[PDB]
Design a protein around this ligand. Structure first.
Ligand code: HEM
Ligand code: HEM
Lengths: 181, 181
């Protein structure tokens, strides 16, 4: 099953350390996040929000980029990776109306998204989930996990991505920092 | 709402003219197709199958290709467009594992998918729906509609596409020919 749900509330595998409402409407602070592999039609007991998305095919990365990523990218669920950050992202209408070449040019040629992110591997593991096509309020759910030794580096990455051309099209962003229970 | 369902059964806006089970498991012959904008968790009793997909962003077409398409592509629901064909398609695991550049090169550089398709406009109107990401048995639901005038041309187009490199990755395909009621 390629669908994942993230329920903010009183139960889950992850304790919420903090929520930073970076851009646009925020997410209610809660005690924990519960992650479920599957859709979840009915709101859990004592929960404040649910986010959902699916794992999908590659949309931008070219073969040589995939080869570079595969050589260094870590797996999820490393024993040392006790911190995580869930970052829902929405991009503007102006982005989604662009053609494929226009988007790829902004994403890599101008913003160097993959080349910058590679600078943070193997420390940071990640998962990308898509949800615009489900009708959700965000377009992406992005997930990152790492040992505490990489927290400073991860915060620098965030600032570097926010300085990029690609980020001129980001309309909503929240950071949910988590610690593994 | 970006989701569409196609219910094969005894009711609907479209009468089934024929079903050709081109490759892989077919779809049961039925009297009619009912098309609904929205999902349908409860399939009607006298219906045989339900297909669903969503409209999404562009995956391959470049700006100059979109411009060419926009100059000539017809609207849906033209008065004369009394014939349609619903063609669910599934592509292989080897296709999906390829990177974005590899897929674009097969789609256009080798197969000329858009250049060939443009030869059949304005006669043929179309919609593309995506459903691999919903866990459906097919990956795409493709829809075409046109006057009787263009049936012979549409049949030529089908044969041309099936001769392409891109088609070497198609592993399931069915044609549901319809007439507007
Ligand atoms: C940690 C190192 C990172 C690496 C190696 C990396 C790599 C990538 C790659 C290769 C893609 C494209 C996938 C495809 O072709 O479909 C992608 C997409 C994406 N990434 Fe990153 N990324 C990193 C960090 C980040 C961070 C920190 C953020 C958010 C603050 C983020 C947000 C996104 C988004 C929103 C997308 C989807 C873009 C779109 O489809 O428009 N990434 N990432
Ligand atoms: C009638 C003229 C046609 C035109 C102008 C045309 C045009 C296109 C365009 C431009 C795309 C890419 C959309 C994107 O970038 O996301 C596309 C995708 C697609 N089309 Fe066609 N098409 C035509 C006929 C057909 C026919 C007859 C079939 C099926 C037999 C078909 C099957 C598909 C499929 C399966 C995709 C999805 C490809 C993928 O994402 O891997 N098309 N079409």
């Amino acid at each position: 099953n390629n669908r994942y749900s993230f329920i903010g509330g009183r139960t889950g595998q992850w304790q919420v350390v903090k929520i930073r409402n970076v851009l646009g409407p925020g997410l209610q602070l809660v005690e924990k996040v519960n992650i479920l592999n599957g859709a979840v039609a009915e709101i859990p007991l004592d929960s404040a929000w649910r986010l959902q998305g699916f794992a999908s095919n590659i949309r931008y990365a070219i073969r040589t980029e995939l080869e570079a990523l595969q050589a260094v990218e870590p797996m999820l669920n490393r024993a040392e990776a006790i911190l995580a950050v869930l970052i829902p992202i929405k991009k503007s209408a102006q982005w989604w109306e662009m053609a494929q070449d226009e988007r790829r040019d902004i994403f890599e040629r101008e913003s160097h998204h993959t080349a910058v992110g590679l600078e943070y591997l193997p420390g940071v593991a990640r998962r990308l989930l898509h949800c615009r096509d489900l009708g959700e309020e965000f377009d992406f759910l992005t997930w990152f996990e790492f040992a505490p030794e990489h927290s400073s580096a991860f915060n620098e990455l965030l600032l570097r991505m926010r300085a990029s051309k690609e980020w001129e099209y980001v309309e909503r962003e929240v950071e949910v920092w988590l610690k593994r229970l």
